[PDB]
Amino acid sequence: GAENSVAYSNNSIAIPTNFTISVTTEILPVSMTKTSVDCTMYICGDSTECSNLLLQYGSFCTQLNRALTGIAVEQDKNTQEVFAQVKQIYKTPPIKDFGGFNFSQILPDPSKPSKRSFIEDLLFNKVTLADAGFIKQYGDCLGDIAARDLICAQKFNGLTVLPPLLTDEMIAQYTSALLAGTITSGWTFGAGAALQIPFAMQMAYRFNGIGVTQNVLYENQKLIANQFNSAIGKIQDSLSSTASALGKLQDVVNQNAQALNTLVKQLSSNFGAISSVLNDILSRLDPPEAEVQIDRLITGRLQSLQTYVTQQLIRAAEIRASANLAATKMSECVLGQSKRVDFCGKGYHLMSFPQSAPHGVVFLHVTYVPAQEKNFTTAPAICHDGKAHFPREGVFVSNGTHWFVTQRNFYEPQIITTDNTFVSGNCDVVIGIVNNTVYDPL
Amino acid sequence: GKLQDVVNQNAQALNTLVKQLSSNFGAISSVLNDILSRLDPPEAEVQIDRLITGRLQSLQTYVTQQLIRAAEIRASANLAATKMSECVLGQSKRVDFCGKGYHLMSFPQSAPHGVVFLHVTYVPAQEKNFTTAPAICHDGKAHFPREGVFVSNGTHWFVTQRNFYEPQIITTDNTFVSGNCDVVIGIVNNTVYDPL
Amino acid sequence: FTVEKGIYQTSNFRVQPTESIVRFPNITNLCPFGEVFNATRFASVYAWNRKRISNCVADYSVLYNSASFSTFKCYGVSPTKLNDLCFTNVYADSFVIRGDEVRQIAPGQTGKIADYNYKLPDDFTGCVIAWNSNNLDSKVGGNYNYLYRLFRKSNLKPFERDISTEIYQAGSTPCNGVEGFNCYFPLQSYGFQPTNGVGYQPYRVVVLSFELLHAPATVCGPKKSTNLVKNKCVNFNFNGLTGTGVLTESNKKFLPFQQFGRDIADTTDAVRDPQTLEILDITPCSFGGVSVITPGTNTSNQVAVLYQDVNCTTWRVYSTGSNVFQTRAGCLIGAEHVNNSYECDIPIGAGICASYQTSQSIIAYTMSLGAENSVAYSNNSIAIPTNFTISVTTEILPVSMTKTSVDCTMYICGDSTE
Amino acid sequence: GKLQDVVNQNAQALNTLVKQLSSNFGAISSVLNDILSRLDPPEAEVQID
Ligand SMILES: *[C@@H]1O[C@H](CO)[C@@H](O[C@@H]2O[C@H](CO)[C@@H](O)[C@H](O)[C@H]2NC(C)=O)[C@H](O)[C@H]1NC(C)=O
Ligand SMILES: *[C@@H]1O[C@H](CO)[C@@H](O[C@@H]2O[C@H](CO)[C@@H](O)[C@H](O)[C@H]2NC(C)=O)[C@H](O)[C@H]1NC(C)=O
Ligand SMILES: *[C@@H]1O[C@H](CO)[C@@H](O[C@@H]2O[C@H](CO)[C@@H](O)[C@H](O)[C@H]2NC(C)=O)[C@H](O)[C@H]1NC(C)=O
Ligand SMILES: *[C@@H]1O[C@H](CO)[C@@H](O[C@@H]2O[C@H](CO)[C@@H](O)[C@H](O)[C@H]2NC(C)=O)[C@H](O)[C@H]1NC(C)=O
Ligand SMILES: *[C@@H]1O[C@H](CO)[C@@H](O[C@@H]2O[C@H](CO)[C@@H](O)[C@H](O)[C@H]2NC(C)=O)[C@H](O)[C@H]1NC(C)=O
Ligand SMILES: *[C@@H]1O[C@H](CO)[C@@H](O[C@@H]2O[C@H](CO)[C@@H](O)[C@H](O)[C@H]2NC(C)=O)[C@H](O)[C@H]1NC(C)=O
Ligand SMILES: CCCCC/C=C\C/C=C/CCCCCCCC(=O)O
Ligand SMILES: *[C@@H]1O[C@H](CO)[C@@H](O)[C@H](O)[C@H]1NC(C)=O
Ligand SMILES: *[C@@H]1O[C@H](CO)[C@@H](O)[C@H](O)[C@H]1NC(C)=O
Ligand SMILES: *[C@@H]1O[C@H](CO)[C@@H](O)[C@H](O)[C@H]1NC(C)=O
Ligand SMILES: *[C@@H]1O[C@H](CO)[C@@H](O)[C@H](O)[C@H]1NC(C)=O
Ligand SMILES: *[C@@H]1O[C@H](CO)[C@@H](O)[C@H](O)[C@H]1NC(C)=O
Ligand SMILES: *[C@@H]1O[C@H](CO)[C@@H](O)[C@H](O)[C@H]1NC(C)=O
Ligand SMILES: *[C@@H]1O[C@H](CO)[C@@H](O)[C@H](O)[C@H]1NC(C)=O
Ligand SMILES: *[C@@H]1O[C@H](CO)[C@@H](O)[C@H](O)[C@H]1NC(C)=O
Ligand SMILES: *[C@@H]1O[C@H](CO)[C@@H](O)[C@H](O)[C@H]1NC(C)=O
Ligand SMILES: *[C@@H]1O[C@H](CO)[C@@H](O)[C@H](O)[C@H]1NC(C)=O
Ligand SMILES: *[C@@H]1O[C@H](CO)[C@@H](O)[C@H](O)[C@H]1NC(C)=O
């Protein structure tokens, strides 16, 4: 990183005079492809004798089907925990009078057949799935034999992919409900009932939550709305530019596809047998020896399945941890406001917006970042009549001739008064106290 | 059920493991005694090495599954410890971490292979529609609430705490002045009482 | 005997074959067993003969009426499958050896024959046939026309022939191709006599070398060809390669030397029909997944079946019946479609859930996401609570799981010292 | 110790892995060279697989 130094001193403080509203994108996996394996078709494809030999392994199989079923269930639980945290479906009002804040690029547009936002459409257009549909009829792979499609080769070997319980439309509807709740009711819909509030005023609260007096927002409301709209436009331009931004989600798709393709390739292995092809053994050897070679192939292919399932269980644990993190963020950033540093983006967190994505969630984190800082000379306290006056909430600064007190995160100098400071003890103990005067209102 | 499943899973794994003893793994028989009682060592040893390999693989599978479940339980236990620390020992501002609502306090209870938290939360029950304004102009000055909102019942303006309707008269000790009324959008006219 | 409420993933859908089809090259010639097994003169083992056998039918049933083999041994393939098989090329290696040397005609063997006159590959596919010839290859005064090599500088390679007759230098001194001390002739002969002991009697050995299931066949078994049936799951046999599958037309331009195609997993993709030089694709019949949706067996014995990747808007289903409808998860049979949404009970997938309602039947429906409502948002209206409730919720978390310990010896080798 | 155990565990795993080379796994010998030096390929290959 770049090397720099900070001008530290015992009587100098840097205070921001301006700020920027930034929007960051955090991408998290939530689910991964649900799989199901028919041990008989994979190991003993269309062979009754092999299946009959295989039946004494019924337990190794049923424990593999249980593990994969458990994974598929946990993928649906993960999705439900991330997106289904609101009991009711909220809808936006017909009038978008949000104080100048433009949400048209994140709220659903009713004119498309699936009520997704434009940014969500971009997300679906950057990550490319493998199945592209959960129906693949026998005639559709019967006539594509000229074509080496991977899905057909999987399905002929007992390897299938189950559809998710929650479709992209249902997830989009949940994210729409979450946006309408956060925008029209702030955090109140998370705790209990959705309590309507003007958007600008909730932003006044969000500013108070980060130590910035609400009058700053109202005075700069036009600037804040313009910075937000520009940040959203920049997010749109970024997602529209490249594709690797969502690599974290694409890798999940790729890993699952790779595992299945790898599994299919393992069928070419002999595992010590004279041939990997069951039919060549059966067509050349009589049962007493075909059975010796075949038990070996059954063992090898069962080990391959065991390896696959183990890898899927480990990845499922990885996805679950990511999904739990995503649910935590949904709860503590979208439904509330986070004081946890860098949990919901860099800066002082204001609010977040969920967007759905294939096998994942994208959070748009709106944060307050100090933009232009200044060097002021400061003091921890001022002596007046021998009394030591301290700020209740803020710091003392001087422009070189006059002492003022101001809010910590935004330069807003105030005259030193008895209603801003408090007295405790006297000036002769505290180190670095300076002399000034404190005005007493009539 | 979430706790019962753990018990069931462990019982199932052991029962499954026992059932695997009936498998031949390619051997002429799963029973060591039938091999030894029928075959002389040079061939009993060939069949037996095969059974040893198969049963060792079964154990390897069991242990791997237990390690994965143990990671699952550890993650749950770490979450439980986090809740114990930040809900029972303290008070949580983290939304929906310790139940739905605004968290007040929590109580631990033990359970077989687990912990049960009773989360006591504050939930708003009866809401009302008030007309509001971000600020009020008085003598040209813009007055803002320090902690709360401005509401009106239609004839009089009051200021009240955010999570519970408790209307107060607008005074100089409840609001603060910054700038003037001509910049802030939605400001309304009223009066601010100055205590003697 | 009890199945809990839910959806279970069961065995895929499976078509059974309807008929078997046997296809072989349209050759009617019989293999020249008489010219091999009944020959006036066999070659010597040092100069063994190699006859090519092609374009014929190998029955070997004819041999039963006259020949009686002392040994028969197939490496590679089983002796009972040879009728159900055909070969890519066949070579018959024919020679006479001494009886005690028959054991040496095998992979892995050593001796004056295995090393000096007839070595086999350790990757040998084929059959070793031997029988005694004491009443043909031996005379009174003995038969000295059968020669073997006794001295060689090194062992042979498999199927290597070394007919040379140069003088073998046993000693340190060159011999300039003359007979003398430490300079022996490498060729020696057998004295086969009708009064000689069994191990010193002549044996006639024929080695049949053949590469199976990998190239065009010309030497086929007595199996009947059948007519060809397309687009049906059948049990096929193409040049000895057996299997189950659907045979369809293909566009794979095989080269004249290619007989079979394969996938990466090494299974057969296509074959060239030996009767009509066309290429047929082999697509396994069984395909797709079947899920079973059921209330517990203590409630009802009615089930619904979801057929994944079939369409229903000659179906590949076990039973149509009534109540058949297409979902994006597959074709669901046995569940009545109800327009009303409910909370999900038995998940089906793709937004579809099922439940057992009331007269009683299984229903399928699109799941509800929660009640739909709207918020009265405006720029000057706020909702503020006037009352509150204290609620208590229960959150249950696992902390530990049963501690286990396994004695590998008792589990694997229970009460067995060995 | 919490950090030392990580180092120890990784070292232990590798050392354990090396020790597994002494196992026969049902073969006549764990040493590839002793099989190859005593058995011809058709049987050395059965033991070696
Ligand atoms: C704080 O920064 C913003 C921009 O970061 C300033 O707004 C810009 O002001 C210049 C000069 O008036 C304009 O030309 C730009 O178009 C403004 N940008 C936007 C987005 O409005 C703002 O004036 C700064 N405030 C202070 C007090 O320095
Ligand atoms: C919000 O921003 C958009 C551009 O990001 C403004 O323009 C609209 O864009 C959408 C989609 O690109 C179009 O369907 C609309 O017709 C556009 N509107 C106009 C007037 O051109 C949009 O106007 C902004 N919203 C507001 C309230 O100004
Ligand atoms: C701040 O003001 C106090 C009071 O005027 C100063 O204290 C005086 O210091 C001088 C010199 O050190 C003494 O002679 C006086 O007797 C002190 N008066 C009292 C009341 O203590 C103090 O020095 C001033 N400090 C600064 C930094 O200006
Ligand atoms: C709030 O009160 C101020 C002051 O009485 C109003 O400002 C006056 O508006 C009228 C008409 O717009 C002007 O003719 C006066 O000159 C204004 N006076 C001053 C001092 O600015 C303001 O319009 C009132 N607003 C509302 C909503 O009642
Ligand atoms: C194949 O021929 C080569 C060449 O004649 C043989 O190798 C020779 O073996 C003699 C043995 O005394 C050596 O003295 C020569 O130096 C070798 N020459 C070379 C080029 O290797 C080889 O042994 C023959 N192989 C067989 C199986 O007979
Ligand atoms: C707030 O709600 C509680 C109950 O949710 C109200 O208490 C009930 O009041 C009625 C009428 O007086 C009694 O009949 C019930 O027995 C009370 N319930 C309990 C648990 O005490 C309470 O009066 C409400 N307060 C307001 C201001 O509306
Ligand atoms: C003359 C060319 C023959 C080529 C045949 C090639 C491959 C098929 C082999 C068929 C059997 C060889 C004869 C042995 C029959 C068994 C006789 C018996 O056990 O009683
Ligand atoms: C504050 O002072 C230091 C050194 O005196 C200087 O490097 C720094 O740039 C100053 N800050 C600003 C905002 O100019
Ligand atoms: C400090 O601020 C006061 C208040 O406006 C001003 O009068 C004074 O000139 C300023 N001094 C400097 C050095 O900026
Ligand atoms: C602050 O630092 C300067 C220089 O290091 C020193 O001269 C001055 O006395 C210090 N003041 C205090 C209050 O420490
Ligand atoms: C608030 O007003 C809206 C529409 O004006 C109404 O639907 C809602 O019920 C009102 N709130 C209450 C608590 O009555
Ligand atoms: C608003 O509250 C005041 C204070 O009690 C009351 O005098 C007035 O009548 C109320 N108006 C309405 C419309 O409720
Ligand atoms: C509030 O909204 C109403 C209707 O949309 C409009 O007439 C009124 O002028 C708006 N007021 C402000 C301050 O935006
Ligand atoms: C082999 O010879 C015997 C007797 O000469 C004869 O009966 C038999 O048919 C012959 N075999 C064949 C295949 O011609
Ligand atoms: C018989 O063989 C010839 C090849 O010479 C082939 O054309 C013909 O189709 C075969 N018979 C049948 C019934 O296929
Ligand atoms: C099944 O239903 C019967 C009622 O006929 C009930 O007694 C039994 O406990 C139930 N068992 C399960 C596992 O649901
Ligand atoms: C096949 O199913 C799809 C839905 O998966 C449907 O849109 C299509 O129309 C169906 N095919 C026919 C011929 O109806
Ligand atoms: C469901 O609604 C569709 C049209 O909305 C109608 O055609 C169909 O008959 C309805 N079915 C039932 C069972 O009400």
C-alpha dihedral over A123, A126, A131, A132, to 10 degrees?
70
* Residue position matching structure tokens 């009174």: C140
CB of A50 within 6 A of ligand 3: the answer is no
Q: Is C402 on the interface with B (CB under 8 A)?
A: yes
Contact A319, A252 (CB under 8 A): yes
Contact C240, C274 (CB under 8 A): no
Q: Which of B25, B49, B55, B67 to mutate to test the interface with D (most CBs of D within 10 A)?
A: B49
Chain B positions touching A190 (Cβ under 8 A) are 95-96, 100
The helix/strand/coil state of A52 is: helix
Q: Looking at the complex, report in whole angstroms how far the Cα of residue D27 sits from the nearest Cα belonging to chain B.
A: 9
Q: Which of D9, D20, D25, D47 to mutate to test the interface with B (most CBs of B within 10 A)?
A: D25
What is the rounded CA–CA span in Å between residue C241 and residue C253? Answer: 20
Both tokens of C301, joined, read: 């014995």
What is the rounded CA–CA span in Å between residue A283 and residue C223? Answer: 14
Task: Compute CA A123 distance to the chain's CA centroid, rounded to the nearest angstrom.
Answer: 13
What are C314-321's contacts with CB under 8 Å, separation 24+?
C316/A138, C316/C13, C316/C15, C316/C287, C316/C288, C317/C13, C318/C13, C318/C290
What is the rounded CA–CA span in Å between residue A416 and residue A398? Answer: 11
What is the rounded CA–CA span in Å between residue A214 and residue A61? Answer: 63
The enclosing H or E element of D42 equals: helix D41-48
Chain C positions touching D42 (Cβ under 8 A) are 107-108, 122
* Residue position matching structure tokens 């009959």: A52
Resolution of the model in angstroms: 3.1
The helix/strand/coil state of A78 is: helix
Find the closest chain D residue to B50 by CA distance: D26
Q: Is the dihedral of CA A279, A281, A282, A284 positive or negative?
A: positive
Both tokens of C133, joined, read: 């010839």
Find the closest chain B residue to A189 by CA distance: B101
What are C309-316's contacts with CB under 8 Å, separation 24+?
C309/A134, C309/A135, C309/A136, C309/A137, C309/A138, C309/A155, C310/A135, C310/A137, C310/A138, C311/A135, C311/A137, C316/A138, C316/C13, C316/C15, C316/C287, C316/C288
What is the rounded CA–CA span in Å between residue A347 and residue A171? Answer: 29
Nearest one of A173, A164, A184, A230 to A366, comparing CA atoms? A230
Going by DSSP bridges, is the β-strand pair C361-366/A434-435 parallel, antiparallel, or unpaired? unpaired
Residues of B with CB under 8 A from a CB of D: 46, 49-50, 52-53
- Return the half-sphere exposure (C-beta side, CA atoms, 13 A cut-off) of residue A375: 7
Both tokens of A276, joined, read: 């990997």
Three-state SS string over chain C comes to CCCCCEEEECCCECCCCCCEEEECCCCCCECCHHHHHCCCCCCEHHHCEEEEECCEECCCCCHHHHCCCCEEEEECCCCCCHHHCEEEEEEEEEEEEEHHHHHHCCCCCCCHHHHHCCCCCCCCCEEEEEEECCCCCCCCCCECCCEEECCCCCCCCCCCCCCCCCCEECCCCCCCCCCECCEECCEEECCECCCCCHHHCEEEEEEEEEEECCCCCCEECCCCCCCCCCCCEEEEEECCEEEEEEEEECCCCCCCCCCEEECCCCCEEEEECCCCCCEEEEECCCECCEEEEECCCCCCCCCEEEECCCCCCCCCCCCCCCCEEEECCEEEECCEECCCCCCCCEEEECCEEEEEECCCEEEEEECCCCEECCCCCCCCEEEEEEEEEEEEEEEEEECCCCCCCCCHHHHHCCCCCC
Q: How far is the CA of A415 from the centre of ligand 9 (A)?
A: 12
β-pair partners for C94: C49, C206
CB of C55 within 6 A of ligand 15: the answer is no
What is the rounded CA–CA span in Å between residue A175 and residue A158? Answer: 35
What is the rounded CA–CA span in Å between residue A404 and residue A382? Answer: 11
Q: How far is the CA of C414 from the centre of ligand 1 (A)?
A: 83
Both tokens of A201, joined, read: 């005023």
- Return the half-sphere exposure (C-beta side, CA atoms, 13 A cut-off) of residue C39: 17
CA–CA distances in Å: residue B192 to residues B143, B181, C411? 9, 14, 86
Q: Which stretches does DSSP call E strand in B81-113?
A: 102-111
* Residue position matching structure tokens 């009829």: A137
Please give the span between the terminal C-alpha atoms of chain A, in angstroms, as a whole number: 55
Nearest one of C219, C58, C214 to A280, comparing CA atoms? C214
The enclosing H or E element of B177 equals: strand B175-180
The enclosing H or E element of A297 equals: helix A287-329
The helix/strand/coil state of B189 is: strand
Both tokens of C16, joined, read: 């059974």
Exposure pattern of A166-189 as b/e (b: 16+ CB <10 Å)? Answer: bbbebbbbbbbbbbbbbbbbbbbb
From the CB of residue A264, how many other CB atoms can be counted at a distance below 10 Å? 20
Q: Looking at the complex, report in whole angstroms how far the Cα of residue B108 sits from the nearest Cα belonging to chain A.
A: 21
The phi, psi pair for B40, rounded to 5°, reads: -70, 155
Nearest one of A38, A265, A73, A36 to A160, comparing CA atoms? A36
Both tokens of C355, joined, read: 């439940």
**CA angle, A286 then A290 then A296, to 5°:** 170
What is the rounded CA–CA span in Å between residue A25 and residue A362? Answer: 7
Q: How far is the CA of C393 from the centre of ligand 6 (A)?
A: 21
What is the rounded CA–CA span in Å between residue B121 and residue A190? Answer: 13
From the CB of residue B193, how many other CB atoms can be counted at a distance below 10 Å? 11
Amino acid at A15: I
User: Assign residue C330 a region: left if phi > 0, alpha if psi is -120 to 50, beta otherwise?
Assistant: left
Nearest one of C283, C323, C284 to C302, comparing CA atoms? C323
Both tokens of C8, joined, read: 């279970």
What is the rounded CA–CA span in Å between residue A112 and residue A5? Answer: 53
Local structure of residue A267 (DSSP, 8 states): G
The phi, psi pair for C44, rounded to 5°, reads: -75, 155
- Return the half-sphere exposure (C-beta side, CA atoms, 13 A cut-off) of residue A198: 21
Contact C306, C266 (CB under 8 A): no
CA–CA distances in Å: residue B160 to residues A69, B127, C65? 53, 14, 116
What is the rounded CA–CA span in Å between residue A177 and residue A427? Answer: 57
CA–CA distances in Å: residue A187 to residues A4, A190, A338, B94, B126? 40, 6, 11, 12, 17
Contact A391, A420 (CB under 8 A): yes
Contact C245, A46 (CB under 8 A): yes
Chain A positions touching B49 (Cβ under 8 A) are none
Please give the span between the terminal C-alpha atoms of chain B, in angstroms, as a whole number: 65
Q: Is the dihedral of CA D25, D29, D35, D38 positive or negative?
A: negative
What is the rounded CA–CA span in Å between residue A419 and residue A412? Answer: 16
What is the rounded CA–CA span in Å between residue C369 and residue A160? Answer: 27
Exposure pattern of C76-114 as b/e (b: 16+ CB <10 Å)? Answer: bbbeebbebbbbbebbbbbbbbbbebbebbebeeeebbb
The total number of residues written for chain B in this structure: 196
Local structure of residue B86 (DSSP, 8 states): I
From the CB of residue B148, how many other CB atoms can be counted at a distance below 10 Å? 18
The phi, psi pair for C401, rounded to 5°, reads: -135, 160
Both tokens of D39, joined, read: 């058995």
What is the rounded CA–CA span in Å between residue C240 and residue C23? Answer: 9
CA–CA distances in Å: residue C288 to residues A41, B169, C378? 11, 73, 53
Q: Is C75 on the interface with D (CB under 8 A)?
A: no
Residue A286 neighbours by CB under 8 Å, 6+ apart: C78, C79, C80, C81
What are C322-327's contacts with CB under 8 Å, separation 24+?
C325/C364, C327/C352, C327/C364
Task: Compute CA A235 distance to the chain's CA centroid, rounded to the nearest angstrom.
Answer: 15
**CA angle, B74 then B78 then B83, to 5°:** 145
Q: Name the CA radius of gyration of chain A, rounded.
A: 31
Residue A115 neighbours by CB under 8 Å, 6+ apart: A108, A109, A169, A172, A173, A176
Relative to the alpha carbon of B156, which ligand is closest? Answer: 12
Inter-chain touch B50–D25, beta carbons under 8 Å: no
Chain C positions touching B32 (Cβ under 8 A) are 413-414, 416
Longest Cα pair distance anywhere in chain C, in angstroms? 131
Local structure of residue B3 (DSSP, 8 states): T
Query: What is the atom index within ligand 6 of the atom nearest the CA of C386?
Result: 27
Chain D positions touching B52 (Cβ under 8 A) are 26
Contact A327, A91 (CB under 8 A): no
Find the closest chain A residue to B14 by CA distance: A63
Nearest one of C160, C74, C300 to A289, comparing CA atoms? C74
Residue C183 neighbours by CB under 8 Å, 6+ apart: C167, C168, C169, C170, C171, C173, C175
From the CB of residue C67, how many other CB atoms can be counted at a distance below 10 Å? 14
Residue C370 neighbours by CB under 8 Å, 6+ apart: A84, A86, A87, A88, A89, A177
Residue B157 neighbours by CB under 8 Å, 6+ apart: B133, B136, B150, B151, B170, B188, B190
Chain A positions touching B61 (Cβ under 8 A) are 60, 63, 306
Residue A186 neighbours by CB under 8 Å, 6+ apart: A195, A197, A202, A205
β-pair partners for B143: B136, B177
Contact A440, A416 (CB under 8 A): no
Contact B143, B151 (CB under 8 A): no
Please give the order of strands across the beta sheet that includes C324-327. C6-9, C290-294, C304-307, C330-333, C324-327
From the CB of residue B71, how many other CB atoms can be counted at a distance below 10 Å? 14
Q: How far is the CA of C362 from the centre of ligand 5 (A)?
A: 84
Q: How far is the CA of C60 from the centre of ligand 7 (A)?
A: 5
Exposure pattern of A8-47 as b/e (b: 16+ CB <10 Å)? Answer: eeeeebebbeebbbbbbbbbbbbbbbbbbbbbbbbbbbbb
Nearest one of C377, C368, B167 to A194, comparing CA atoms? C377
Amino acid at B121: T
Amino acid at B26: G
Nearest one of C24, C158, C23, C162 to C91, comparing CA atoms? C158
- Return the half-sphere exposure (C-beta side, CA atoms, 13 A cut-off) of residue A140: 14
CB of A374 within 6 A of ligand 9: the answer is no
Relative to the alpha carbon of B166, which ligand is closest? Answer: 6
Contact C151, C170 (CB under 8 A): yes
The helix/strand/coil state of B166 is: coil
Contact A348, A337 (CB under 8 A): no
Contact A297, A285 (CB under 8 A): no
Amino acid at B150: F
What is the rounded CA–CA span in Å between residue C383 and residue A194? Answer: 9
Residue C199 neighbours by CB under 8 Å, 6+ apart: C98, C99, C100
Both tokens of C255, joined, read: 């080269």
Nearest one of C289, C331, C347 to A35, comparing CA atoms? C289
User: Residues lining ligand 1, CB < 6 A?
Assistant: A 18, 20, 223, 226-227
* Residue position matching structure tokens 């205070």: A15
Q: Which of A39, A50, A56, A59 to mutate to test the interface with B (most CBs of B within 10 A)?
A: A59
- Return the half-sphere exposure (C-beta side, CA atoms, 13 A cut-off) of residue C336: 11
Residue nearest to atom 20 of ligand 6 (CA): C389
